[PDB]
Amino acid sequence: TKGKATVAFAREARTEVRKVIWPTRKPTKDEYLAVAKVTALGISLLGIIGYIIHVPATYIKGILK
């Protein structure tokens, strides 16, 4: 029983911290955007490489199917 209570409390106590941790720039007129940048940049490379390697052929497999 108690176990559930503590678990429920921890979640609440955490939600409180999230309130204190923000000010800065919520988080910063450069931070957030960063993640999206690096993240998108990375996905672009992996995605681009797949396209160059992908499609390219599909044109042959179909033109010779």
């Binding site: 921890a10 999206a36 690096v38 990375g42 996905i43 992996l46 992908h54």
Partner: protein, 442 residues
């Protein structure tokens, strides 16, 4: 005693204690990446050029691509890991890894099973009618190639894992999703065009651009996190000098937010992956234990209630269906998450050492930094949630990320975005370790 005999027969990868330059870890990774994409271009040798649509549900988490030399993809490896976490998780086979024994036991063992699940899935796939023509002869041939391709990955993972950057799996998944996006949106039968063309044709189709939006929205959302750092610290430290770089210092932060539960959810989604597969499989090859599929996927049964709704647009026409899934996923997440504890996870024990040195100590001077050295409980406490939180947090997000639905896979995009960032970090911790040949633990 253990399955050590055949276990010792299962090859491994020669890890050189030599100099593996950043440039080389990089160039290595890349070679793996391509052999992957490439294998995803090659169809499996099979006269029956006719295949029954596809399983729009397994590909994403599996990083596979049905009909190709990797039609099974990471699927096995994940399955395997799933069981282990299940056994070694629900105590069923209690193990205290600590010793290099249990550690290398849990591992080596799982690895094997991965090859077991490698073939099983193969057979199960064809047996689920993934290709249409069950020519016992031809069927056999296929299975061969199939599971053998997945094998190559298992070893390609090993390579990356000890010769390059990031992780095979992690990579692979991101590899697939990214492509699935760049191609789906811009490739041959690309959507951006189908939409663009539809505009020119004069009959603006909101259904061609739709899925593309779905993906932006998700990406933006999924990203939300990994930014809730928390500028803090800090300590004091001391030591010379000094002209420019001298005055004592320490370490800053914060670091980020999310990830940890990266492998956990990969397993939850993967569980469902082996259900829709295992149900259809044990459908057109037996009794409707799990559910009545028909039409390819499932339209009733455990299977039905446990089939992710995404693809193009969110389905409202079945509220209850939504509710269950969500809750179903949520809990499954909690699970593998807990099973990740009994095993291992973002630990304070480990952060202790390293958050108790940043500064000095030493003899020369009086640089402070008491920290620290007995004040860890402050982490395990503030910690718990961090990763999480979870089976509803991440798991929730992931799920809702699917209702919304997006290209590549709402959930897939998620993992990807994460994997990609944890992959950026990897590229930095490296760009630096390529200077001070020592601090390979700070």
């Amino acid at each position: 005693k253990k399955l050590i005999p055949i276990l010792e027969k299962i090859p491994e990868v020669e890890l050189p204690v030599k100099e593996i330059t950043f440039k080389e870890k990089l160039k290595w990774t890349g070679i793996v990446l391509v052999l992957y994409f490439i294998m995803g271009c090659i169809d499996v040798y099979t006269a029956g050029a006719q295949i029954p649509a596809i399983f729009e549900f397994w590909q994403t988490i599996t990083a596979s691509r049905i009909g190709t030399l990797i039609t099974l993809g990471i699927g096995p490896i994940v399955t395997a890991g799933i069981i282990m976490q299940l056994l070694v998780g629900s105590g069923i086979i209690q193990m205290d890894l600590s010793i290099p024994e249990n550690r290398a036991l849990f591992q080596g063992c799982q690895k094997l099973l991965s090859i077991i699940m490698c073939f099983v899935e193969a057979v199960l796939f064809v047996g689920a009618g993934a290709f249409g023509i069950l020519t016992p002869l031809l069927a056999f041939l296929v299975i061969i190639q199939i599971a053998f391709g997945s094998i190559i990955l298992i070893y390609l993972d090993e390579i990356v894992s000890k010769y390059g950057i990031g992780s095979g799996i992690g990579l692979f998944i991101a590899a697939g999703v990214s492509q699935t996006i760049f191609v789906g949106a811009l490739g041959p039968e690309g959507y951006l065009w189908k939409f663009l063309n539809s505009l020119i044709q004069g009959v603006p189709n909101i259904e061609y651009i739709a899925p593309i939006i779905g993906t932006i929205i998700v990406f933006l959302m999924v990203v939300y996190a990994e930014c809730m750092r928390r500028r803090i610290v800090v300590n004091y430290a001391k030591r010379q000098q000094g002209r420019r770089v001298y005055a004592a210092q320490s370490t800053h932060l914060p670091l980020k937010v999310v990830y940890v539960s990266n492998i956990p959810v990969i397993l939850a989604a993967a569980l469902f992956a082996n259900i829709q597969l295992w149900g259809l499989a044990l459908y057109r090859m037996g009794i409707p234990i799990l559910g009545h599929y028909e039409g390819g996927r499932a339209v009733d049964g455990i299977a039905y209630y446990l089939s992710t709704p995404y693809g193009l647009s969110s389905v409202i026409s079945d509220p209850i269906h939504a509710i269950v899934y969500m809750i179903a996923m949520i809990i499954t997440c909690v699970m593998f998450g807990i099973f990740w504890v009994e095993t291992t996870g973002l630990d304070p024990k480990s952060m202790a050492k390293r958050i108790k040195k940043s500064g000095a100590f030493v003899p020369g001077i009086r640089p402070g930094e008491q920290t620290a050295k007995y004040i860890e409980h402050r982490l395990k406490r503030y910690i718990p949630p961090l990763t999480v939180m979870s089976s509803a947090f991440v798991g929730f997000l992931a799920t809702i990320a699917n209702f919304i639905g997006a290209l590549g896979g709402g959930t897939g995009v998620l993992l990807t975005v994460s994997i990609v960032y944890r992959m950026y970090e990897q590229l930095l911790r490296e760009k630096v370790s390529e200077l001070h040949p020592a601090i390979a633990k700070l």
